[PDB]
Amino acid sequence: TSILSIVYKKDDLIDLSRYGAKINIGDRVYYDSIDKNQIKLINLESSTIEVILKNAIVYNSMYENFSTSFWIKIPKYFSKINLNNEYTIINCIENNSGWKVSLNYGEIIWTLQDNKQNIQRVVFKYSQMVNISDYINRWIFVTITNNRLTKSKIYINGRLIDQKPISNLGNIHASNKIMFKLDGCRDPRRYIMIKYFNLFDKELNEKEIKDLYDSQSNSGILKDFWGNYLQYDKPYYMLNLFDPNKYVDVNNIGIRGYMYLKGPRGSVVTTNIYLNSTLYEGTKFIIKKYASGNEDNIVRNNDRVYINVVVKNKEYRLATNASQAGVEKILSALEIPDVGNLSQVVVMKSKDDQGIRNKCKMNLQDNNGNDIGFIGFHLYDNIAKLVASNWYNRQVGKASRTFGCSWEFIPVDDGWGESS
Amino acid sequence: GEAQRRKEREELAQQYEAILRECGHGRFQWTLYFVLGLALMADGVEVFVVGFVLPSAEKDMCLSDSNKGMLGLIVYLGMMVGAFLWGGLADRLGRRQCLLISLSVNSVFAFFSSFVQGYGTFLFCRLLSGVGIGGSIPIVFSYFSEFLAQEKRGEHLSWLCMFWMIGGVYAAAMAWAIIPHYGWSFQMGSAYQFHSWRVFVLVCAFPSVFAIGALTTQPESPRFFLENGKHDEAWMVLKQVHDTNMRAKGHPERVFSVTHIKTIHQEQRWGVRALSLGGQVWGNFLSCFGPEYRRITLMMMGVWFTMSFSYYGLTVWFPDMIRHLQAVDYASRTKVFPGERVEHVTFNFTLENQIHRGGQYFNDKFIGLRLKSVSFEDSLFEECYFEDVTSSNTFFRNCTFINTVFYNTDLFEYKFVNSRLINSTFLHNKEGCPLDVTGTGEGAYMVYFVSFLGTLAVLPGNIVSALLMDKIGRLRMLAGSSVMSCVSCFFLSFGNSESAMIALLCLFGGVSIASWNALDVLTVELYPSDKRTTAFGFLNALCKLAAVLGISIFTSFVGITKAAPILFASAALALGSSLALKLPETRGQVLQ
Ligand SMILES: *[C@@H]1O[C@H](CO[C@@H]2O[C@@H](C)[C@@H](O)[C@@H](O)[C@@H]2O)[C@@H](O[C@@H]2O[C@H](CO)[C@@H](O)[C@H](O)[C@H]2NC(C)=O)[C@H](O)[C@H]1NC(C)=O
Ligand SMILES: *[C@@H]1O[C@H](CO)[C@@H](O)[C@H](O)[C@H]1NC(C)=O
């Protein structure tokens, strides 16, 4: 069902479909070190990705249906240069007819043009003045389905946002050649990241789109805030999804000491451009291997690890005393060689029992493999203290809504630009 | 019918005067005088609490504009309600009973307002305390009048007005002694804070409690018993008065010679009693506007409204204009630094009342600086750093911030006026009010002193009026004090400094007090004993409403011109004196 599907291979970019589309990569196209399958494009002429199809799959028909899907990561727009600057990122227009994907300040735009120079556009807009955004500098699964009989639809993360009727356009003659390069951007320090680019010759319904979104999500591997792979030996700032206005802090070191959620968060502001909340506040959480049999540094599902809390540029250990009053066990930061037999192993969970993908979860376990519980927060006399409790496990068993057991790991990123 | 009722009322009025002259004046009258004096001192104290605690309560409760204005008027609105309510209820329940109820309500709500942490709850509690204290003056005067013989009634009633002055002095002294200790931060509850002004509120609620304690040991007025058909109780109270008086004199052997006293012939269930009380009170209020009392009532209404308007307007106008003069003097001393270029320095400071303009700061560290009335205009901060910055009345106008960090600063969003921030970071912002709250320091001291001078020039006027009320008369004292008040209002023009306005405030306060004394005695003497508290409470409620109107109008005229307040006060006082000169003379008459 897929005609074009750009994937990575041994030091090359290939097409998994049975067509062998020719791919030409420019001399300034970059790849990541850990997830090298994802590609990065910068604002230069040499930052070029070029794909050429066959004559038997060229979109030149009358009522032919089609759809496209990919993952896009766009950094934050920092100044007023980026305003009213629609620039194309994906191009399939020859002789002023075809389909294009472009970006503007807080907008992803899908445009299609016929041979009669008719314009039809579908736009997804995300705000940049939000406290914590789900789209700024984070991976977005964008899929567009075009029904030449009824209408064209945009989908982000499997959800419908906009849809526009496209009955007016009669015939589209898309190019034999597709362009991946920034075009029309006056910002010299602007770039994008794309991955998993697929084409289909039919309008995908919601079922197939959700299936593709979950299949490409790699639910067996944990993801950080930006959507990349979670890695051992990397400092991470901690964000609690249920209470995202406070950050993890400590007051003392030892069994008497505890860690809590201190707030409110600060703000990073560029006037009339962005008013975001600071993400580089709190104490860093390093993750260390304990029984990982994989050679890589990627944290996968059901991995038993250690947690180090970086306090005053010094590393400590996350542990509790299992035998104490109450169901919940208070989290504490101890000296690494002074942990003794305190419960410190954490099982990292990325999906539920049924296999449904969710956010990052930590399950504190003892040396007997007994579930002390999921790591969350509980309020003691108006102080949100970090605890490990079995109440979250009870709610999970009852298919209820847990409160405070979901976490996000925020490493320092260049696309965010906050001063630390 | 009605003529027979008037005849029996006159016979009772004459017999009561004869009985009172038999009883004499002595220890009982002075004991009741001091008890009702405590009741009036509570009233005098009540009108200073919010004015004295506003500077601290504004910062402690985040009070904005139109929230410090409604707090400065809430006592008068509560008083306006309470005066009418308790004056109406006093003729159906009794002077002492309604006085006890009102004083208890005032004490309870004044104690409860001392611990309230919010604003709306504080406003409600203070309004209800004003309601409780609104019925003090009418009931107190109409309760003391029914124990006095005609021989010396103006002097004995006029000596009752020193207690408002005593209450004002007490409030000023306690405010001076308690509030300036800002260090007191007693903690009972994490989210609640207990400062010194709440202790001041408690100490200001004390005199009402003392008044209740003193009033619990006094007897109800015999005239109230006689009007309602209760003869044995009235006879017992008159016998007690005579016995106490004679024991004080030194002849505890004579016998009360009165045997029978003329009395006025009287012709689910909780709701029934409430409806009956409401109907009776409305009947008394309407009969106050009767064919017999319609001219007297209207002239009393005019006099009370005009005098209250003028007095309260000027009394609130004087401190506001003193503050305005101080503000002008302060703004005249401001320093201006046009053009600066600062680079590569950790530069801290404590500047007050300054304006920097056209500055250019590059990589500057501002650690631990206190800003008071400091304004930066047309400045540019690049790669700057602000830490431990304390700010008060500080603004940034037409400023540009580039790559600057605000760490542990109270520079909230309202202090950047039409500014542009680029890549700025706000971290660990201090706790503070969302809007500007201003700050008062040493000047509060002087404020208290001014109050102590505004309620001490009153004393010569009180002494003169008390000594001379019977010798010249109520009408002439009232007219001669209103005319002098109008003359002082004219003199108001020749004042432009703080000392001049303090002198003018002292003069006006010392002049109008005799007029107020005379009006109190007149409105006590001009009504029958079955409508005294109703009419007096209605007139006092009108006084409080006029006080609200005059305070608002005269506050709106501060800093605009001196012609409007002078003209308003002089016109109102002239009309009041003209209406007062048409009043019937009550001197040398039985308390009918
Ligand atoms: C606002 O900052 C961003 C990010 O830079 C970070 O934040 C700065 C305050 C400072 O601490 C830097 O050291 C941080 O790296 C700027 O965007 C980047 O700027 C750098 C130059 O410092 C440049 O090399 C990158 O290419 C820029 N990235 C992008 C996506 O444009 C941004 O320029 C700053 N705003 C202004 C008006 O200069
Ligand atoms: C702040 O200024 C004072 C002078 O008023 C100076 O003595 C002090 O050293 C300064 N602070 C720092 C941290 O340099």
Ligand SMILES: *[C@@H]1O[C@H](CO)[C@@H](O)[C@H](O)[C@H]1NC(C)=O
């Ligand atoms: C201050 O004046 C105007 C705003 O009133 C503004 O255009 C100007 O640029 C400002 N000055 C500087 C130095 O930015």
